[PDB]
Amino acid sequence: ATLKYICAECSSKLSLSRTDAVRCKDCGHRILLKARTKRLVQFEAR
Amino acid sequence: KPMVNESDGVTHALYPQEARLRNLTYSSGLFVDVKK
Amino acid sequence: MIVPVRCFSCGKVVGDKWESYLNLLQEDELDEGTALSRLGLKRYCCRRMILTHVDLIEKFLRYNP
Ligand SMILES: [Zn+2]
Ligand SMILES: [Zn+2]
């Protein structure tokens, strides 16, 4: 139910708050993305 | 071979793709046998 | 970079013809010039479409998450 961030390589829904490091549950790979918005988006279909 | 000596961690064997994203310098260590 | 649905010039559907064309080439070992005629792509506006597409998406897919 939900998520927030992600890990570039070991793509795995993560997340945390301030001063919780900036690493991942396993892959040190200190990157991390920010997975989509919930508010669905709409597009002109042309 | 390239390395990332960062505080709060070891020294990761740095790679292009990461140094680019992270704005680091894809460099490496230079060591010489100093004799005294 | 996935096949163009329809031809820029005359709009004739061409989205389906991708896979078919690739076969008439690898399997049925034909020549582009023919494989195209076979798929009903008559004038060059449609021909140029398929004959030229560079299906990059394949290399893209080869990445990971
Ligand atoms: Zn990870
Ligand atoms: Zn056409």
Side-chain angles (χ1 to χ4, degrees), chain C residues 7 10 12 45-46:
Chain C
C7 156
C10 81
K12 186 191 182 321
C45 72
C46 301

Coordinates of all heavy atoms in Angstrom, one line a residue, chain C residues 7 10 12 45-46, ligand 2:
Chain C
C7 N 1.3 5.9 -42.2 CA 2.3 6.6 -43.0 C 2.1 8.1 -42.9 O 1.0 8.6 -43.2 CB 2.2 6.0 -44.4 SG 2.8 7.1 -45.8
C10 N 0.4 9.5 -46.5 CA -1.0 9.2 -46.8 C -1.8 8.5 -45.7 O -3.0 8.1 -45.9 CB -1.1 8.3 -48.1 SG -0.8 6.5 -48.1
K12 N -2.0 5.6 -44.5 CA -2.4 4.1 -44.6 C -1.7 3.3 -43.5 O -0.5 3.3 -43.3 CB -1.8 3.6 -45.9 CG -2.3 2.1 -46.2 CD -1.5 1.5 -47.4 CE -2.1 0.1 -47.6 NZ -2.3 -0.6 -46.3
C45 N 5.7 6.4 -50.3 CA 5.3 7.1 -49.1 C 5.0 6.1 -48.0 O 5.3 6.3 -46.8 CB 4.1 7.9 -49.3 SG 2.5 7.0 -49.5
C46 N 4.5 4.9 -48.4 CA 4.3 3.8 -47.4 C 5.5 2.9 -47.3 O 5.9 2.5 -46.2 CB 3.1 3.0 -47.9 SG 1.6 3.9 -48.1
Ligands
ZN2 ZN 1.5 6.2 -47.5

